[PDB]
């Protein structure tokens, strides 16, 4: 007979395959199982035989690699896949049972067990490997005794024993948090599933449970939708992808244990959906200022991180009811239909998520509307995300603070983010691939889009730094409106630059004052560094007259525009620079590989073609200052910018503000506290950002102190005149 625990893991089979939900007449199904066929094929075609052999398989021989292990473990649960998926070529195999089986055993003897000590990754001893044998263990518990089962196990406990800890077995343990808490959920539940221990079950619930608070310091979610993880690092769309999808999965099961959570304390997790994800999601695209190293990963770019956010969201949506479940089953369905990119289904990785995918997007009773518009100031972790409905483009602003650390190269991987969060900009437009197709190791790392800085040499090996200022931050008037600054000096002290966006509705204005350089470096403004569609190319203008860019810089000094000009107006980029500038551009290919900024990833070449577009800054004291205007055509921008001739209100070392006379909007930053006079209308008097709005006689106030991290009383800060 059985038990409860293996009605459990029959559930938690489920959804971590779906074999029961196989249908060989389903094309999206049917391409899973041969994918899945392919790989346990390749496997079995190269595990070692005759004479207990150094290694399993030989490209995962080398047990001092930890990832060499869970990659092993991984093959296994793969082959338990399909021994138990009745269409399957190997359903019910001899060959693969027995492989199985024995395959356990040797590992078991010769490289993972209580025996051992961690070597290389703990992240594999820990997480990855148990994980892979927790699985296998369940699809196969028809195969296994459960003498067996706790003896497979047993080093799963030596490794992890405390369920509110990773890195027991170390001499420096650290507290489980976010979306590595998770993980110890699916490391601790299973096993104690398999295990048929209570105490196991029971007190890794309870521990989990802490990811249901909202935090105002240190790794989690926070109120504002802002997620830290590693202590201090803008991180929703990696660990906190691994927290909702690894969670969405739990919880069905966690639900039926003698343990199950509080539907009050689950709550939260609308929160992070609504405040945290979707405004990270645009076309079907997770943003890349969220994902921390995992940008440097060539498995894993923008529209395949998306989809592991989304299944998990539709997961939540199937657990959930009434308006809730319709709420988020519309979100979910009008973001995968957006997606004119990428396939969806090619990251949807077990029956039941493609099921629920096909379901969903064939219902007619649930609505698919295309998104609003939106501004999100996440605030706590230095990232601004703005989307306009109504001409199609997202805005991604990438800064950090004495708070945050600018960028993380960890494990080998991001060896070249070094300036991602240097006042980095993002633009999503009609070209939903730009950011993808090998945008991250082919794009010049010195000339991130946004960024001022010098053009000294920098090292692969550098880890990230916080920036010696708290003033940054973003003052959010409404859904359309914002205004950011930055206190930006540079990774080594030699140049600092006043930097603010003015996100005014359908464009943002990018101002900088104050740049001072002490070295003997040269240093830029990289206006724009846009990847290009050889299908589609741009037609160039400066100042309303073609250009012919080449591979080598071409200058062109008194300019006041440029635009770039598809044949699609949804990709169309316009810059208007308020006093005529010197500005150098050119269009080159530039070529790399994934392994250049990702020790672990392919050596084989990638190119891209990119339009860069950059102004020098010679002296002490100079200055930016242009408007980015997107998703228009030629002549609309002409017009556009004869409209904002007199936009531009300040730009010098102390204020700095940009006025939409069109929406009778100010966006305002001062350094001081002097009284600032504004278009003879009103005054400013405190240091801090502003965002103002005028409706008749009557004036709107958003006002932040990105140092205290606090608004004011009005009249503290403004004055009618």
């Given at each position: 007979?059985?038990?409860?625990?293996?009605?459990?893991?029959?559930?938690?089979?489920?959804?971590?395959?779906?074999?029961?939900?196989?249908d060989?007449?389903?094309?999206?199904?049917?391409?899973?199982?041969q994918?899945?066929?392919?790989?346990?094929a390749?496997?079995?075609?190269?595990?070692s035989?005759?004479?207990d052999?150094?290694?399993?398989?030989?490209?995962?021989?080398?047990?001092?690699?930890?990832?060499?292990?869970?990659?092993?473990?991984?093959?296994?649960?793969?082959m338990?896949?399909?021994?138990?998926?009745?269409?399957?070529?190997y359903?019910?195999?001899?060959?693969?049972?027995?492989?199985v089986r024995?395959?356990?055993?040797?590992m078991?003897?010769?490289?993972?067990n209580?025996?051992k000590?961690?070597?290389?990754?703990?992240?594999?001893?820990?997480?990855?490997?148990?994980?892979?044998?927790?699985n296998?263990?369940?699809?196969?518990?028809?195969?296994?005794?459960?003498?067996?089962?706790?003896?497979?196990t047993?080093?799963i406990?030596?490794?992890?024993?405390?369920?509110?800890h990773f890195?027991?077995?170390?001499?420096?343990?650290?507290?489980?948090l976010?979306?590595?808490?998770?993980d110890?959920?699916?490391?601790?539940?299973?096993?104690?599933?398999?295990?048929?221990?209570?105490?196991?079950?029971?007190?890794?619930?309870?521990?989990?449970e802490?990811?249901?608070?909202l935090?105002?310091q240190?790794?989690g979610?926070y109120?504002?939708?802002?997620?830290?993880?590693?202590?201090?690092?803008?991180?929703?769309?990696?660990?906190?992808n691994?927290?909702?999808?690894?969670?969405?999965?739990?919880?069905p099961?966690?639900?039926?244990?003698?343990?199950?959570?509080?539907?009050?304390?689950?709550?939260?997790?609308?929160?992070?959906?609504?405040?945290?994800?979707?405004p990270?999601?645009?076309?079907?695209?997770?943003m890349?200022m969220?994902?921390?190293?995992?940008?440097?990963?060539?498995?894993?770019?923008?529209?395949?991180?998306?989809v592991?956010?989304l299944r998990?969201?539709?997961?939540?949506?199937?657990?959930?009811?009434?308006?809730?479940?319709?709420?988020?089953?519309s979100?979910?369905?009008?973001?995968?239909?957006?997606?004119?990119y990428?396939?969806?289904?090619?990251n949807?990785?077990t029956?039941?998520?493609?099921?629920?995918?096909q379901?969903?997007?064939?219902?007619?009773?649930?609505?698919?509307?295309?998104?609003?518009?939106?501004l999100?100031?996440?605030?706590?972790?230095?990232?601004?995300?703005?989307?306009?409905?109504?001409?199609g483009?997202?805005?991604?602003?990438?800064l950090?603070?004495?708070?945050?650390?600018?960028?993380?190269?960890?494990?080998?991987e991001?060896?070249?983010?070094?300036?991602?969060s240097?006042?980095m900009?993002?633009?999503?437009?009609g070209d939903?691939?730009?950011?993808?197709?090998?945008?991250?190791?082919?794009?010049?790392?010195?000339?991130?889009?946004?960024?001022?800085?010098?053009?000294?040499?920098?090292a692969?090996?550098?880890t990230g730094?916080?920036?010696?200022?708290?003033?940054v931050g973003?003052?959010?008037?409404?859904?359309?409106?914002?205004?950011?600054?930055?206190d930006f000096?540079?990774?080594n002290?030699?140049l600092?630059?006043?930097?603010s966006?003015?996100?005014?509705?359908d464009?943002?204005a990018?101002?900088?004052?104050?740049?001072?350089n002490?070295?003997?470096?040269?240093?830029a403004?990289?206006?724009?560094?846009?990847?290009?569609?050889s299908?589609?190319?741009?037609?160039?203008?400066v100042n309303?007259?073609?250009?012919?860019?080449?591979?080598?810089?071409?200058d062109?000094?008194e300019?006041?525009?440029?635009f770039?000009?598809?044949?699609?107006?949804?990709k169309?980029?316009?810059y208007?620079?308020?006093?005529?500038?010197?500005?150098?551009?050119?269009?080159?290919?530039?070529?790399?590989a994934?392994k250049?900024?990702?020790?672990?990833?392919?050596d084989?070449?990638?190119?891209?073609?990119?339009?860069?577009?950059?102004?020098?800054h010679?002296?002490?004291?100079?200055?930016?200052?242009?408007?980015?205007?997107?998703?228009?055509?030629?002549?609309?921008?002409?017009?556009?910018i004869?409209?904002?001739?007199?936009?531009?209100?300040?730009?010098?070392?102390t204020?700095?503000?940009?006025?939409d006379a069109?929406?009778?909007?100010?966006?305002?930053?001062?350094?001081?506290?002097?009284?600032?006079?504004?278009?003879?209308?009103?005054?400013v008097?405190?240091?801090g950002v502003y965002?103002?709005?005028?409706?008749?006689?009557?004036?709107?106030?958003?006002?932040?102190?990105?140092?205290?991290?606090?608004?004011?009383?009005?009249?503290?800060?403004f004055?009618?005149?």
């Amino acid at each position: 007979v059985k038990d409860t625990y293996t009605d459990r893991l029959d559930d938690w089979n489920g959804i971590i395959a779906g074999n029961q939900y196989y249908d060989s007449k389903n094309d999206q199904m049917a391409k899973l199982n041969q994918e899945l066929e392919g790989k346990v094929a390749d496997s079995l075609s190269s595990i070692s035989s005759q004479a207990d052999r150094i290694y399993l398989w030989e490209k995962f021989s080398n047990y001092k690699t930890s990832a060499n292990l869970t990659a092993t473990y991984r093959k296994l649960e793969e082959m338990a896949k399909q021994v138990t998926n009745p269409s399957s070529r190997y359903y019910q195999d001899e060959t693969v049972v027995r492989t199985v089986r024995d395959s356990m055993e040797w590992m078991h003897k010769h490289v993972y067990n209580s025996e051992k000590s961690i070597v290389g990754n703990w992240a594999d001893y820990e997480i990855g490997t148990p994980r892979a044998i927790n699985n296998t263990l369940s699809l196969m518990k028809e195969y296994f005794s459960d003498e067996e089962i706790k003896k497979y196990t047993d080093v799963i406990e030596k490794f992890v024993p405390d369920p509110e800890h990773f890195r027991k077995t170390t001499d420096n343990p650290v507290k489980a948090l976010g979306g590595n808490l998770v993980d110890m959920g699916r490391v601790k539940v299973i096993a104690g599933l398999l295990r048929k221990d209570d105490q196991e079950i029971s007190s890794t619930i309870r521990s989990i449970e802490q990811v249901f608070k909202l935090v105002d310091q240190g790794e989690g979610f926070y109120q504002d939708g802002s997620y830290i993880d590693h202590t201090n690092v803008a991180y929703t769309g990696a660990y906190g992808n691994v927290l909702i999808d690894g969670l969405s999965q739990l919880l069905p099961v966690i639900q039926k244990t003698k343990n199950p959570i509080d539907k009050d304390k689950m709550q939260t997790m609308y929160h992070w959906i609504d405040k945290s994800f979707a405004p990270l999601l645009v076309n079907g695209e997770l943003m890349d200022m969220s994902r921390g190293r995992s940008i440097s990963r060539a498995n894993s770019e923008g529209h395949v991180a998306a989809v592991e956010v989304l299944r998990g969201i539709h997961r939540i949506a199937d657990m959930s009811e009434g308006e809730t479940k319709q709420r988020l089953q519309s979100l979910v369905k009008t973001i995968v239909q957006s997606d004119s990119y990428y396939d969806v289904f090619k990251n949807l990785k077990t029956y039941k998520d493609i099921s629920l995918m096909q379901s969903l997007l064939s219902d007619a009773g649930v609505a698919s509307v295309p998104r609003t518009s939106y501004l999100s100031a996440f605030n706590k972790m230095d990232k601004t995300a703005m989307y306009n409905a109504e001409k199609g483009f997202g805005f991604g602003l990438s800064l950090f603070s004495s708070r945050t650390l600018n960028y993380e190269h960890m494990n080998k991987e991001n060896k070249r983010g070094w300036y991602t969060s240097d006042g980095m900009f993002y633009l999503y437009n009609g070209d939903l691939s730009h950011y993808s197709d090998g945008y991250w190791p082919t794009v010049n790392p010195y000339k991130m889009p946004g960024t001022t800085e010098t053009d000294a040499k920098r090292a692969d090996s550098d880890t990230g730094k916080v920036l010696p200022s708290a003033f940054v931050g973003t003052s959010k008037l409404d859904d359309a409106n914002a205004t950011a600054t930055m206190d930006f000096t540079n990774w080594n002290q030699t140049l600092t630059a006043h930097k603010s966006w003015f996100m005014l509705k359908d464009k943002i204005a990018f101002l900088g004052s104050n740049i001072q350089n002490t070295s003997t470096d040269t240093a830029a403004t990289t206006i724009d560094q846009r990847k290009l569609e050889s299908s589609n190319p741009y037609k160039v203008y400066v100042n309303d007259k073609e250009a012919s860019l080449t591979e080598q810089e071409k200058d062109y000094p008194e300019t006041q525009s440029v635009f770039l000009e598809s044949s699609d107006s949804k990709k169309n980029i316009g810059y208007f620079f308020f006093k005529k500038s010197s500005i150098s551009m050119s269009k080159a290919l530039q070529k790399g590989a994934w392994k250049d900024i990702n020790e672990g990833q392919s050596d084989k070449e990638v190119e891209n073609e990119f339009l860069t577009i950059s102004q020098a800054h010679k002296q002490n004291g100079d200055s930016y200052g242009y408007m980015l205007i997107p998703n228009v055509d030629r002549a609309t921008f002409n017009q556009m910018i004869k409209e904002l001739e007199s936009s531009l209100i300040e730009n010098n070392e102390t204020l700095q503000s940009v006025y939409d006379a069109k929406q009778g909007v100010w966006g305002i930053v001062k350094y001081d506290d002097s009284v600032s006079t504004i278009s003879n209308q009103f005054q400013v008097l405190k240091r801090g950002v502003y965002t103002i709005r005028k409706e008749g006689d009557e004036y709107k106030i958003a006002y932040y102190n990105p140092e205290t991290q606090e608004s004011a009383p009005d009249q503290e800060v403004f004055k009618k005149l």
